[PDB]
Design a protein that fits this description.
part of a larger assembly; 5 chains; A alpha+beta (89); B alpha/beta (220); C mainly alpha (111); D alpha+beta (138); E little secondary structure (68); B: alpha/beta; two-stranded antiparallel ribbon; 8 helices; 8 strands; 11% strand; D: alpha+beta; globular; binds magnesium ion; binds zinc ion; RNA-binding; ribosome; Pathogen; Hibernation
RNA sequence: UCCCCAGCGAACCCACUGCCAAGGGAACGGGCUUGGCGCAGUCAGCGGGGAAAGAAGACCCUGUUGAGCUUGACUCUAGUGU
RNA sequence: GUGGUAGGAGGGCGCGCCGGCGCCGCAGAAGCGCAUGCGUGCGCAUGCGUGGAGGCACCCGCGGCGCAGAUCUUGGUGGCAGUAGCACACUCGGGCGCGAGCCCCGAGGGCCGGGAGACGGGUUCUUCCGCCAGGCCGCUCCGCGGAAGGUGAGCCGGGUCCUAA
RNA sequence: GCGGCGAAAGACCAAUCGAACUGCCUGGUAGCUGGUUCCCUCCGAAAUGUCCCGCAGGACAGCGGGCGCCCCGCAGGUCUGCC
RNA sequence: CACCCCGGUGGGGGAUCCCUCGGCCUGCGCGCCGGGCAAGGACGCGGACGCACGCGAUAGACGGCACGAUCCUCAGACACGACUGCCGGUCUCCGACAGCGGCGCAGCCGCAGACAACCCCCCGGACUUAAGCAUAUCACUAGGGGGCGGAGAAGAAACCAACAGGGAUUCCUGCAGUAGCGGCGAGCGAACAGGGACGAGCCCGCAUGGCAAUCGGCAUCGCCGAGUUGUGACAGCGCACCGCGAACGCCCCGGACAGGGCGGCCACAGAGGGCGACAGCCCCGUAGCAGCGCGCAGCGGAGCGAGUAGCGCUGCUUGGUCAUGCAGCGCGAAGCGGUGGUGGCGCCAUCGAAGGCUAAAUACGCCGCAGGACCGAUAGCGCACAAGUACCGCGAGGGGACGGCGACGAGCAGCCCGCAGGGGCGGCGAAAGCGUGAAACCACCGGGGCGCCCACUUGUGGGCCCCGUCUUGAAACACGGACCAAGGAGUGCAUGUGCGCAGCGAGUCCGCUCCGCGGCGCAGCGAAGGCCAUCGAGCUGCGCACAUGCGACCCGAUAGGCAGUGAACUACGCC
């Protein structure tokens, strides 16, 4: 009753895909992601010290940041076509 | 070892009271954590960087030991007792002139030490190069070789370039003698070749008997 | 505690106590020497130090001795023949809040 | 001694630099000494080995053989010389991989712009020897 | 010489007794109990620890009172 | 169902274990002492014993360890009111 | 003169690494196995076998430095035990096949749900090929393994509609 | 969640409820239980006194060991004598 | 026959040892996010492509420049540039809007979101210590909220002082575990100096009146706007920045020479790594070698700070004491005011609040670099491996395991048997055949039957209960222990004390720093006013023992708190 019989009724799925963080944590009734806190503007304060190691900055692709490290290393010379045009004048 | 949410499961579960790793579904789950006897546990009394790495020694007592380690180099029974092959060497203390600075190339410097009877000493050190016998060879200490000739010089006879590459030759300025050169391995009697500039400065750094040192303030 | 000893005054009860180790101390010294050399090379003829006055130390423990002050008063710079704003352009430090107290400290700094 | 603090004497970093060298560096690490007849002409000690280089083997089983380089493989660092071979079971002859340090170049290939690259190292060696001659002159 | 632990390897109850023990803090922490159960320690070795003596000087100045 | 077989094939538990009688012993022994016996080490039943296994006794006491709860406990406090 | 718990002390043995110093090693290092010897003892040395690249001794120095126990931790392995247990309404013939109680076909005898949607699953669907792995036995079978194929909307459902709490 | 909710059982609130679950403070504290790793050599106890919200604990004293220093006569004894 | 013990061979398992493209620690460097669409996510992208990693419809090298011949599993590509390196392009979609705000504003902009180590502001615990506990402590911490930057914050005295006076801030040393606070209990606890690092100073407001001399915008030398409720000022920057780098042969052993032997050679290079064993001379490297320029102009200067200061009350805070700071409320200033370790008043002394900016010394993770008396695959990060992966949880979250042939040249399928897996004769190789291969345990074989000790003529006799542990007392019908391997517990720091050792000694202490008249000692007593010896070896280091604070020998509570997540089970209510 309390255990094995009651697990047959667990066919609802409350936490669905979050559109911000992509974890299966967006609640349907609550309309809030339990992981990242969407749709609050700021990110939810992560519930563990390891949660930054899993989900924080640097754990993803860092598509813009890897470009701006490379430009900062070279001195922010920017677009190579426009670099020669500013140098001629 | 402390990166878990581990708790003791308590008594009553026929298992020891050590903290168990929380969660399920992995092999790490329910295993012991946090303890020094646990696998992947924190070692009890972890090592800290606030350990006192350096040791203080009184400066006057360190200066006496530098003086006594210097006197050990002047005793030919001590120098051959610590492994230096000093049969060919003229005197001990062997003092070379301040025209040592006119040697420009180390081929002429190796020839100069050869005609001082140090050829067997340098060859003993060069062939003694072997791989260290422990895990120190992993930690950037792969090769050990013996300690050979120490050359003490001063700033007016600077022979650093022409001599530093000869295997078995260490160079030390006379203004700063460490005991790591004078008794390497806590074994007195390092084979030391002096320049004339460094030798004549010894009565200035340490003074004479009963007198203060001129170059070292307040040393007797 | 057990025996005869001085009563313990060890203040490590706070778990928030930090430790400042000094492993950078030989390295900071070589950085400090390098910056001083680069300052001297940036101001090649000009001395790296300001000219600072000789002041007497404050309390009764220390008024037997003099030390090197912060800057000269503008009335000291005027008696020496200088405008204090001109005096800063040459390597003289100027202190606007020190009071010209007596003739002995005044005439020593003017000289 | 190495007095440059910015370069490693570390074994771990030197070993990682050898096995994760990129292809430009792996070409340089696969250099081979020249003969004395090549060193009187070119002057430099060694040069990176290439296909169609004549080579005498200096160490190993094939020591003393001469042959052309037929294959260089930068990953696993192996030069395959013509007439340094071993058969498989099915009679197929396989070239045996020799390290470039065990090969000495007898005749340098000069076809695909390599004569430019040899002369660039030769001239920079000649120019740098002129500067060191003037500095020791002064 | 080496530490005492290097000799106590092999003996149960490292140096602290089987019937007694090395427990965590019997008696309390610090110098507590100076009027209750360590009163014999304070009557013997620090009989002037407790109480007040004399006129307080809020911020005694060392350099002003310097007179060696 | 068991039992017997082909194939498949665990767990509990495990200081070490020939069996009794009395004695002594931490005052109820498988081992000690003194006696009585049994030992080819197999199959099936069985529940006398192993003070059988479960579970760091839930009873009780102790702890200057708690928590739930109460009020004429102590010290405070939201609320109401002035 | 000689016992010894708690306990204190001394001197050594052993381990990782350090500064030295004597050396050894592809003519075989460490490690390991079995022997022999030394040693009151911690332990040490050798022989043979294995091993295939490092190591030893001593003096120094640093220490995460010695285990039978902690319902210790982790890993491995036993006994228990070929035991408990696991299909026991099917039967006969035929087929493919190396191989058949279970796969296929025919017959006989029985039994009970079956077929559509949702949620949930997500390719399990279907075809071809397979299997010496998985299926509480076996399999030629399969919700398994491999390769493919398949989901077509103005009218079905949702959105491009409406509001409920 | 010192919150819900309860035709009231302290029931139920994800196999958890007389205050859920997660992470942290936190290696909470424990006068309590368990364990605490080489050898030989030298010596070797106490389970008593006083006090303590003290009675499963401490501190002091006693006893053990180690380290010393100093040349002062020393004794768990008998004898004699007096209380 | 079984059983047990010992050995041999074979299993079994993965200890040991050796290795290590990993970790850890320290130092240094960098310190650069975002509507130009960030962090993160989703989905796609390879000829054969799952994972990983890369990437964005220009989707598995697009361009420029440099490099210069391979990449590779197949197929192929390639001097019309392979493989690479550096930089730049392209860069889907979700994710920063009910947006908010500035500027006369045809319009142009900004804020949001990330980062959470360092730093600033606000909010703010409890465990804990006090042997209970309530104030105290933990702690003005953890934690939560907000906000920056490469540092931040602070900062040019309404300061310190009491002198013969010093002179921003920050940091170090030091004052000092001191004055002081404190159930005056536990405990807590600064400041001026002195020495040092570093140094740097400035500004708005009350600016002309013979004319706003000032600024913003534009479609621009002219409009429009701001503005008289008042606008107004230039001294600092930039570029360049290499390619080369010495020196070895023979013999022996071996699968192979980097080994051994002999003989040389180079070295401003004998750091390190690779190479078939241990290489200065085989290779990569290593030592070594290279700079500069361009700028700085003018016109006000006594301006001054109010619902403040202060006082009263309250709450918090602090070492701050008849109040240190902060806030709220009531009261509410002055031309003189503030302050003087903090009762009032008076003196004297010293400063000028209620406006603003300010380098440097200081702090610090990611990351990069370099090191190390660190760890060496149960260790070291959780991860040396398709690791925050597999996997689990509704969710917040939780979170592993797993390293090794060789010269990367060979290592095969010839024959017989089997449906096959395979077996046997073979095959390759120095050997191993994804290093070594311990123990538990197992198969077979061989030998032997006490579990141990003693004795000897080896099977007899004699002696032995089960270890650990707590206990008055354990073989106990006390508890823990199936076995084996590996791991596994008095440590670190601070401050003391004692002892030993060491240097110097009325002195002593290098290590903050570029240079301690700083500490302690040479003499104490008292609450103090005051008194002052008839007098005394210390200082510093090293080592041990011990005490205390810290996680404190290791492991262990029930609890308490802070911040979060769940009504898919279940409870009720509504549609
Ligand atoms: Mg339901
Ligand atoms: Mg729901
Ligand atoms: Mg670990
Ligand atoms: Mg070793
Ligand atoms: Mg014990
Ligand atoms: Mg003890
Ligand atoms: Mg007791
Ligand atoms: Mg009392
Ligand atoms: Mg059967
Ligand atoms: Mg009986
Ligand atoms: Mg009997
Ligand atoms: Mg039976
Ligand atoms: Mg029974
Ligand atoms: Mg109990
Ligand atoms: Mg009590
Ligand atoms: Mg004895
Ligand atoms: Mg003992
Ligand atoms: Mg060893
Ligand atoms: Mg040994
Ligand atoms: Mg340990
Ligand atoms: Mg063990
Ligand atoms: Mg034990
Ligand atoms: Mg089993
Ligand atoms: Mg059966
Ligand atoms: Mg049936
Ligand atoms: Mg259906
Ligand atoms: Mg199907
Ligand atoms: Mg099958
Ligand atoms: Mg009831
Ligand atoms: Mg429930
Ligand atoms: Mg602990
Ligand atoms: Mg005795
Ligand atoms: Mg008693
Ligand atoms: Mg007890
Ligand atoms: Mg005592
Ligand atoms: Mg056996
Ligand atoms: Mg393993
Ligand atoms: Mg770092
Ligand atoms: Mg983008
Ligand atoms: Mg391209
Ligand atoms: Mg923000
Ligand atoms: Mg704590
Ligand atoms: Mg308490
Ligand atoms: Mg307590
Ligand atoms: Mg309590
Ligand atoms: Mg920034
Ligand atoms: Mg600032
Ligand atoms: Mg405090
Ligand atoms: Mg103005
Ligand atoms: Mg070279
Ligand atoms: Mg006010
Ligand atoms: Mg005044
Ligand atoms: Mg005062
Ligand atoms: Mg101001
Ligand atoms: Mg291992
Ligand atoms: Mg690991
Ligand atoms: Mg569950
Ligand atoms: Mg193997
Ligand atoms: Mg006892
Ligand atoms: Mg009892
Ligand atoms: Mg016992
Ligand atoms: Mg009994
Ligand atoms: Mg048991
Ligand atoms: Mg062990
Ligand atoms: Mg301690
Ligand atoms: Mg705990
Ligand atoms: Mg409480
Ligand atoms: Mg809460
Ligand atoms: Zn989300």
């Amino acid at each position: 009753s309390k255990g094995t019989s009651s697990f047959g009724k667990k066919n609802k799925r409350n936490h669905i895909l979050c559109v911000r963080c992509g974890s299966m944590s967006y609640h349907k009734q609550k309309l809030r992601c339990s992981s990242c806190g969407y749709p609050e503007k700021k990110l939810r304060n992560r519930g563990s010290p390891k949660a930054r190691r899993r989900r924080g900055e640097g754990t993803g692709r860092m598509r813009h940041l890897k470009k701006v490290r490379r430009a900062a290393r070279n001195g922010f010379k920017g677009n190579a076509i426009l670099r020669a045009l500013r140098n001629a004048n | 070892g402390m990166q878990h949410s581990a708790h003791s499961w308590g008594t009553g579960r026929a298992m020891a009271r050590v903290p168990r790793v929380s969660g399920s579904g992995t092999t790490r789950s329910g295993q012991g954590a946090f303890a020094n006897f646990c696998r992947k546990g924190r070692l009890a009394h972890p090592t800290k960087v606030i350990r006192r790495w350096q040791r203080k020694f009184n400066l006057n007592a360190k200066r006496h030991a530098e003086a006594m380690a210097l006197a050990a180099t002047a005793i030919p029974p001590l120098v051959e007792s610590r492994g230096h092959r000093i049969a060919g060497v003229k005197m001990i203390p062997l003092v070379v002139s301040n025209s040592i600075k006119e040697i420009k190339s180390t081929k002429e410097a190796f020839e100069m030490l050869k005609r001082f009877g140090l050829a067997e000493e340098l060859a003993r050190v060069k062939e003694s190069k072997c791989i260290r016998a422990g895990k120190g060879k992993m930690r950037n200490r792969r090769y050990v070789m013996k300690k050979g000739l120490l050359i003490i010089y001063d700033n007016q006879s600077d022979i650093q370039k022409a001599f530093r590459n000869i295997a078995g030759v260490d160079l030390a300025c006379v203004d700063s003698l460490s005991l790591l050169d004078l008794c390497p391995g806590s074994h007195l009697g390092r084979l030391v070749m002096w320049t004339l500039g460094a030798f004549e400065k010894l009565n200035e750094i340490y003074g004479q008997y009963g007198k203060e040192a001129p170059l070292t303030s307040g040393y007797f | 505690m057990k025996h005869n000893n001085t009563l313990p005054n060890n203040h490590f009860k706070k778990t928030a106590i930090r430790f400042k180790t000094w492993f950078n101390q030989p390295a900071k010294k070589e950085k400090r020497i390098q910056l001083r050399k680069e300052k001297a090379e940036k101001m090649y003829p000009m001395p790296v130090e300001k000219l600072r006055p000789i002041v007497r130390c404050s309390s009764i423990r220390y008024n037997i001795k003099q030390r090197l002050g912060r800057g000269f008063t503008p009335e000291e710079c005027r008696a020496a023949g200088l405008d204090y704003n001109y005096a800063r352009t040459i390597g003289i430090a100027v202190d606007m809040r020190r009071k010209n107290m007596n003739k002995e400290t005044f005439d020593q700094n003017v000289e | 001694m190495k007095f440059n603090k910015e370069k490693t004497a570390s074994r771990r970093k030197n070993r990682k630099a050898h096995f994760t060298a990129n292809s430009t560096e792996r070409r340089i690490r696969m250099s081979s000494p020249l003969s004395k007849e090549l060193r009187e002409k070119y002057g430099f000690r060694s040069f990176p080995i290439r296909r169609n280089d004549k080579v005498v083997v200096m160490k190993g089983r094939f020591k003393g053989n001469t042959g052309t380089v037929v294959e260089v493989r930068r990953k696993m660092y192996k030069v395959y010389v013509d007439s340094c071979e071993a058969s498989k079971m099915n009679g197929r002859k396989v070239r045996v991989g020799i390290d470039a340090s065990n090969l000495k170049i007898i005749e340098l290939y000069q076809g695909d712009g390599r004569d430019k690259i040899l002369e660039r190292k030769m001239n920079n060696r000649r120019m740098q020897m002129e500067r060191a001659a003037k500095i020791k002159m002064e | 010489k080496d530490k005492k632990t290097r000799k106590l390897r092999g003996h149960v109850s490292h140096g602290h007794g089987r019937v007694g023990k090395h427990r965590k803090h019997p008696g309390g922490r610090g110098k507590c109990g100076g009027m209750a159960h360590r009163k014999t320690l304070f009557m013997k070795y620090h009989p002037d620890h407790f109480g007040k003596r004399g006129m307080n000087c809020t911020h005694l100045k060392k350099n002003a009172r310097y007179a060696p």
